[PDB]
Ligand SMILES: Cc1cc2nc3c(=O)[nH]c(=O)nc-3n(C[C@H](O)[C@H](O)[C@H](O)COP(=O)(O)OP(=O)(O)OC[C@H]3O[C@@H](n4cnc5c(N)ncnc54)[C@H](O)[C@@H]3O)c2cc1C
């Protein structure tokens with residue numbers, strides 16, 4: 001009954017049934033069975049990006065469809081990875097096997113199947129860079145479907161799976177394309193200290209993990225769902241006004257003039273690091289992460305997020321949007337709405 005083991009935040013709520021699908025038929029069957037009994041279905045990888053708000057009235061299917069195949073192309077390696085594959089383990093594997101290209105995405109929690117959903121990205125790379133396609137099963141018809149990376153409509157923490165294809169499809173495999181001619185991505189932060197000519201894939205991996213281990217909490221210590229909020233993109237005008245009043249604010253100008261701000265900085269500037277509500281707190285090494293400090297209840301997390309958002313809104317007139325998927329009793333609910 002308990003969802004606690006299934007979400008990295010460690011939120012304790014119940015689901016009517018929790019089922020581990022080792023293969024597609026199992027997943028599809030679990031889905032058919034649950035929906036036939038009129039209940040909603042939720043597919044999870046490692047539950048590292050979800051916040052259960054209350055007991056879930058349906059079935060939660062843990063996607064454990066594993067296996068990896070490697071197709072050889074002159075120019076690149078094509079990986080067809082089961083949705084249930086652990087992402088970080090895949091990264092180490094590819095590096096181990098001499099197929100670099102995933103190093104900047106090292107240590108990001110979750111299953112490979114969930115990687116396209118919010119276009120996992122860090123240290124200058126997003127999954128859209130290496131994603132060839134995504135294969136899913138249309139739950140209603142058992143119709144397997146493939147979407148090219150372009151058809152996935154990848155965006156900043158966004159993809160078609162958060163829209164048109166949410167619920168209708170269960171991702172069962174992800175196709176990655178890793179160029180045989182490796183080109184390191186050293187544009188982000190401390191990676192700029194590395195030399196393109198000398199650096200090896202493992203060296204990037206270590207640099208990336210070093211920054212990650214110093215800033216981000218390990219869920220096995222304190223449950224968390226990573227960055228709780230998306231870095232907001234504001235109008236050039238809002239960005240101008242804000243930077244004039246807060247010059248040192250980290251910002252990332254978009255091609256169209258809008259500017260992305262670092263939500264973590266904004267939260268931090270509100271002296272929020274360490275703030276806690278109930279068993280939940282703002283992580284002190286990366287203010288963007290809300291953690292399960294001491295048997296946090298979901299309401300503690302919701303209230304804390306509300307507080308953080310309000311404070312940042314009142315100081316900078318920038319309104320943060322959660323990056324974590326809020327799961328209500330019958331399915332996903334609006335996160336912003338929940339924390340408003
Ligand atoms: C410590 C920590 C650090 C993080 N760092 C980063 C980072 O640097 N960059 C980044 O981009 N993200 C980061 N995240 C977020 C997280 O790693 C991603 O959102 C990841 O893709 C979630 O994988 P998951 O398998 O745990 O998905 P889950 O949390 O299990 O599910 C996420 C959502 O996708 C759905 N879904 C999950 N699997 C499937 C499937 N097979 N078919 C259909 N829907 C599915 C779920 O129903 C839900 O809506 C971090 C999280 C944590 C805890």
Ligand SMILES: C=C(O[C@H]1[C@H](O)[C@@H](CO)O[C@H](OP(=O)(O)OP(=O)(O)OC[C@H]2O[C@@H](n3ccc(=O)[nH]c3=O)[C@H](O)[C@@H]2O)[C@@H]1NC(C)=O)C(=O)O
Nearest residue numbers: 122123226227229230231250262264265268285286287288
């Ligand atoms: C952890 C996640 O993703 C992470 C990802 O690992 C890192 C690195 O690429 O970039 C995002 O954080 P981020 O924008 O805060 O990256 P950071 O480099 O840590 O910091 C950006 C700026 O904010 C500042 N910053 C950040 C947090 C803080 O508490 N204080 C602060 O001042 C930094 O010093 C920096 O100058 C992700 N988030 C989003 C929401 O886009 C996640 O999605 O769960």
